[PDB]
Amino acid sequence: MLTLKIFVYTVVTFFVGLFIFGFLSNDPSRNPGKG
């Protein structure tokens, strides 16, 4: 069960980090607007 917990923690941390640094990656600049 601890192996499963380690794997799930790794997966959740990976996706959360992707989310966090994706909105850190100049997200207000990714739009088709003028400005």
Partner 1 sequence: LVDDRMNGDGTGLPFGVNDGILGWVIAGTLGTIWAIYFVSQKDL
Supply the minimum distance, in Å, between the C-beta of residue 1 and partner 1. 6
Residue labelled with tokens 């100049």: 26
Contacts with partner 1: how many residues (CB under 8 A)?
15
By CB under 6 A, what part of segment 3-32 binds ligand LMG? 12, 16, 20
Distances (CA, A) of 17 to 7, 22, 31, 33: 15, 8, 22, 27
CA pair distance 7, 33, nearest whole angstrom:
41
Supply the minimum distance, in Å, between the C-beta of residue 30 and ligand LMG. 19
Q: List residues near ligand LMG by CB under 6 A.
A: 12, 16, 20
